[PDB]
């Protein structure tokens, strides 16, 4: 028999300067358990790699340094734009195999946002706590830990698809034939969960034929919302700025409004504050301001460093990821998202959203 | 051989209290020519029927009264919500067959917005000048007249589909079997124009299998815009209010923004002013205000009574109709739209839009 929830428990970073308190596992405690119980390998992936920026991040980097010196195969994947610290990371850990990743060499837009750990095909972490000292110590994060082998092995297959994109000779990033010979395998998806948990992937040109697009799954869960929509992300502005040109993409921005106006869904949004010089964020904020007074919608903002990417629908489906709901992320960026329908696991996630909604850092939307 | 433009020339209403001037045919001159040259029948359709509200409208109603007394079969289609004047219209013209129409008895939402004339299968008018004294004399309108038999006959087939929906015993409005036996025929569409002119229809449950949806054709022409988008409609607010509940529909609202931001299309919009008490119109206006300063977009408003529904794309495609770009109209309301790609006919339409854009009634968008 398979366990309910796939042995998943919540993991988050709650800095001391913030009022967030919980009994769940912490991100610092989570990374120590993965390195301690490691016997075969430790595979880590994130956008930027910089553990030495805080105290707790350096201790995790020392435990990973000691693990690499005992025979554990350590491979760290980072986007080629976090290449500044590469000379610093290799100088402190010569046994750790640092690999730069460029998943999109056709247009140089897709970034490696896969934020997850995996070890021995048994234990794994996934969330938005990137391999940075801030995301371990000073930046609020939110993730999930599970010691279930079948769930960690399916996340390891996500690592194999991302590892092939290396800026070194002929590979999945340089050849079109070596990239088509990639086994893009997934053991579980929205049509076959494991313990009520499944992974959604991104972008579309890296799904193959079996994996499900995270864009289609999130939109379907938002269009199928009946009672409540709770989102804690960076921003839900439908317009992003790639290079020096603005990009418009309101797919997520419309499926949420379709729930509040047409279906009367009680929606609560918790995004960051916005630049007053950004006309796309001011117009988006004033558009949401007229909806809170006309429908059952509520918006609060915060100014702290928080990478939390949370989505809860009808207290029945939860969605934790590292990418933000926008056009640039769900069209080009590569990442893996956590999807679960376990009522007990969603209830603990609803407990976290209610904590952050009434927190002192969450001031009401004022324009 | 077939003539270019299908013998089409512009027709509009330019009241004396307004500064609009042109050498084209007027709506009052257009209705006199149709009644004078009538030999077989005159079929008229609009939402509300009230010709006696102005001077020119009463003269058209007298010419139509004299035509009905000579043997011309006069059938007037009006929506069952314009039934107030029905006792007045029949009292002045007993020989004219007035018919109330309810195209949607399933939900009582679809309204008869078909605004067109047709006579002898030879001459026909189509636009937004409804059968009202205002739309002939005091309300600015815009339409097209053509004495081409094949184009008028295809518009008569639109009248046959609308006439079947009568609130009288068993018919297309009462029976589901008598409504399926309806010949829903079109001779020309977007895949087969006549002289560069074709009709698009609405709603979707009245198209059959041959007619093209006006919603799909307009969105495709907006998504295929390369240089310019010129629209003169009532309003492009993505939210409408059906009954006492708001309805959200941004399909047209998004395809236009996709052109200005992603494709850099120079777009000029001329809509009416909005109620300051309407939060959906204020948020929509402030959203457009931040786009005019960030992209090549310009918006002007007017307060006069104007039913003009115009759409020009890249000076190559023109779209004149009676319904407004919104959710309630293109989802439920029944109407026929004028579509033409004739360069000479679009050039005359571009001449009209430039006149209304710099007119004194078109004040710049101020918030």
Rounded Cα–Cα distance for residues B315 and B344 (Å): 10
Contact B239 A261 (CB under 8 A): yes
Rounded Cα–Cα distance for residues B168 and B209 (Å): 27
**Sign of the dihedral through C-alpha B151, B153, B159, B161:** negative
Measured between CB atoms, does B247 come within 8 Å of chain A?
Answer: yes
**Residues of chain B neighbouring A295 (CB-CB closer than 8 A):** 246
**Residues of chain A neighbouring B265 (CB-CB closer than 8 A):** none
Strand-pairing partners, residue A44, are: A76, A117
Rounded Cα–Cα distance for residues A303 and B290 (Å): 24
Rounded Cα–Cα distance for residues B259 and B291 (Å): 12
- By DSSP bridging, strand A141-146 and strand A123-127 are antiparallel
Q: Using an 8 Å Cβ cutoff, are B184 and B178 in contact?
A: no
Outline where DSSP puts E strands in chain B. 8-13, 25-26, 41-46, 73-79, 97-101, 116-119, 123-127, 141-146, 197-202, 228-232, 239-242, 245-248, 266-272, 297-302, 309-313, 317-321, 335-340, 363-364
Cis check for the bond before A203: say yes or no (omega within 30 of 0): yes
Q: Using an 8 Å Cβ cutoff, are A365 and A272 in contact?
A: no
First to last CA, chain B: 53
Distance (Å) from the alpha carbon of B218 to chain A's nearest alpha carbon: 19
Rounded Cα–Cα distance for residues B247 and A279 (Å): 26
Phi, psi of B28 (to 5 degrees): -70, -40
Measured between CB atoms, does B265 come within 8 Å of chain A?
Answer: no
CATH of the domain at A173: 3.30.870.10
Distance (Å) from the alpha carbon of B279 to chain A's nearest alpha carbon: 6
Distances (CA, A) of B181 to A136, B89, B161, B164, B172: 69, 31, 11, 10, 9
Q: Using an 8 Å Cβ cutoff, are A9 and A197 in contact?
A: no
Q: Using an 8 Å Cβ cutoff, are A206 and A334 in contact?
A: yes
Q: Using DSSP, how many helices (H) and how many strands (E) does chain A show?
A: 11, 18
Q: Using an 8 Å Cβ cutoff, are B237 and B215 in contact?
A: no
Rounded Cα–Cα distance for residues A343 and A118 (Å): 25
Helix (H, G, I), strand (E, B) or coil at A88: helix
Residue B173 DSSP one-character state: T
Contact A294 B286 (CB under 8 A): no
Residue A174 DSSP one-character state: T
Contacts 24+ apart (CB under 8 A), B176-184: B182/B208, B183/B157, B184/B208, B184/B209, B184/B210, B184/B211
Domain ranges, residue B185: 4-364
Distances (CA, A) of B138 to A78, A357, B354: 68, 55, 21
**Could you tell me which of A166, A162, A197 has the C-alpha nearest to residue A183?**
A162
The structural domain count of chain B equals 1
Contact A279 B257 (CB under 8 A): no
Distances (CA, A) of A349 to A83, A124, B299: 34, 19, 45
- Contacts for B225 with CB less than 8 Å, ≥ 6 apart: B259, B263, B265, B313, B314
Q: HSE on the CB side for A270, CA within 13 Å?
A: 26
**Could you tell me which of B97, B188, B112 has the C-alpha nearest to residue B149?**
B188
Other C-beta atoms closer than 10 Å to the C-beta of B146 total: 24
Distances (CA, A) of A159 to A91, A146, A183: 24, 17, 11
Distances (CA, A) of B257 to A331, B294, B299, B350: 18, 12, 13, 21
Sheet arrangement for strand B228-232: B197-202, B335-340, B317-321, B309-313, B228-232, B266-272, B297-302, B363-364
Rounded Cα–Cα distance for residues B118 and A332 (Å): 53
Contact B291 A282 (CB under 8 A): no
Measured between CB atoms, does A279 come within 8 Å of chain B?
Answer: yes
Other C-beta atoms closer than 10 Å to the C-beta of B206 total: 22
What approach was used to elucidate this structure?
X-ray
Resolution in A: 4.0
Work out how many CB contacts closer than 8 A connect A with B: 56
First to last CA, chain A: 53
Distances (CA, A) of A201 to A4, A219, A319, A341: 22, 14, 12, 17
Measured between CB atoms, does B248 come within 8 Å of chain A?
Answer: yes
Distances (CA, A) of B268 to B279, B282, B317: 23, 19, 15
Other C-beta atoms closer than 10 Å to the C-beta of A292 total: 18
- Contacts for B321 with CB less than 8 Å, ≥ 6 apart: B128, B214, B309, B311, B335, B336, B337, B338
- Contacts for B71 with CB less than 8 Å, ≥ 6 apart: none
Rounded Cα–Cα distance for residues B110 and B113 (Å): 9
Residue given tokens 């007037």 in the structure block: B76
Q: Using an 8 Å Cβ cutoff, are B131 and B31 in contact?
A: no
Q: Choosing among B222, B223, B239, which should be mutated to test the A contact, i.e. which has the most A CBs within 10 A? A: B239
Distance (Å) from the alpha carbon of B264 to chain A's nearest alpha carbon: 10
Rounded Cα–Cα distance for residues B98 and B77 (Å): 6
Cis check for the bond before B6: say yes or no (omega within 30 of 0): no
Helix (H, G, I), strand (E, B) or coil at A210: coil
Strand-pairing partners, residue B269, are: B231, B299
- By DSSP bridging, strand B317-321 and strand B309-313 are antiparallel
Measured between CB atoms, does A291 come within 8 Å of chain B?
Answer: yes
Rounded Cα–Cα distance for residues B151 and B214 (Å): 18
Contacts 24+ apart (CB under 8 A), A102-110: A102/A165, A102/A167, A102/A173, A103/A162, A103/A165, A103/A173, A103/A203, A103/A206, A103/A334, A104/A332, A104/A334, A105/A173, A105/A174, A107/A332, A109/A242, A109/A328, A109/A332, A110/A203, A110/A332, A110/A333, A110/A334
Rounded Cα–Cα distance for residues A320 and A195 (Å): 16
């Amino acid at each position: 028999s398979v366990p309910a929830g796939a042995k998943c428990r919540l993991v988050e970073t709650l800095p001391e300067n913030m009022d967030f308190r919980s009994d769940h596992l912490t991100t610092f405690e989570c990374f120590n358990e993965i390195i301690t119980l490691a016997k075969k390998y430790i595979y880590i992936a994130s956008f930027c790699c910089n553990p030495l920026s805080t105290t707790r991040g350096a201790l995790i980097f020392d435990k990973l340094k000691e693990a690499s010196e005992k025979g554990i195969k350590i491979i760290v994947l980072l986007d080629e734009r976090g290449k500044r610290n590469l000379g610093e990371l290799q100088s402190h850990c010569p046994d750790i195999n640092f690999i730069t990743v460029n998943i999109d060499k056709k247009n140089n837009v897709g970034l490696l946002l896969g934020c997850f750990w995996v070890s021995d095909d048994e234990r794994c972490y996934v969330g938005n706590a990137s391999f940075t000292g801030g995301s371990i110590h000073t930046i609020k994060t939110l993730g999930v830990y599970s010691d279930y082998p079948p769930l960690a092995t399916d996340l390891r297959r996500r690592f194999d698809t991302f590892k092939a994109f290396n800026s070194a000779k002929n590979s999945a990033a340089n050849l079109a034939s070596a990239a088509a010979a990639l086994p893009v395998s997934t053991a579980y998806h929205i049509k076959n969960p494991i313990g009520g948990v499944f992974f959604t992937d991104s972008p579309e040109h890296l799904l193959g034929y079996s994996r499900d697009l995270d864009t289609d799954v999130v939109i379907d869960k938002l269009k199928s919302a009946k009672t409540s929509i709770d989102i804690e992300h960076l921003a839900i502005v439908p317009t992003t700025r790639v290079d020096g040109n603005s990009y418009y993409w309101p797919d997520i921005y419309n499926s949420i409004i379709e729930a509040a106006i047409n279906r009367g869904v009680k929606i609560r949004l918790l995004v960051c504050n916005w630049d007053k010089n950004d006309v796309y964020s001011m117009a988006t904020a004033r558009s949401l301001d007229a909806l809170c007074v006309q429908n059952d919608l509520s918006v609060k903002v915060f100014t702290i460093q928080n990478n939390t990417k949370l989505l809860i629908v009808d207290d029945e489906y939860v969605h934790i990821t590292s990418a933000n709901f926008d056009g640039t992320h769900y069209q080009n960026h590569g990442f893996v998202s956590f999807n679960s329908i376990d009522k007990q696991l969603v209830s603990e996630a609803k407990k976290i959203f209610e904590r952050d909604w009434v927190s002192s850092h969450s001031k009401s939307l004022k324009i």
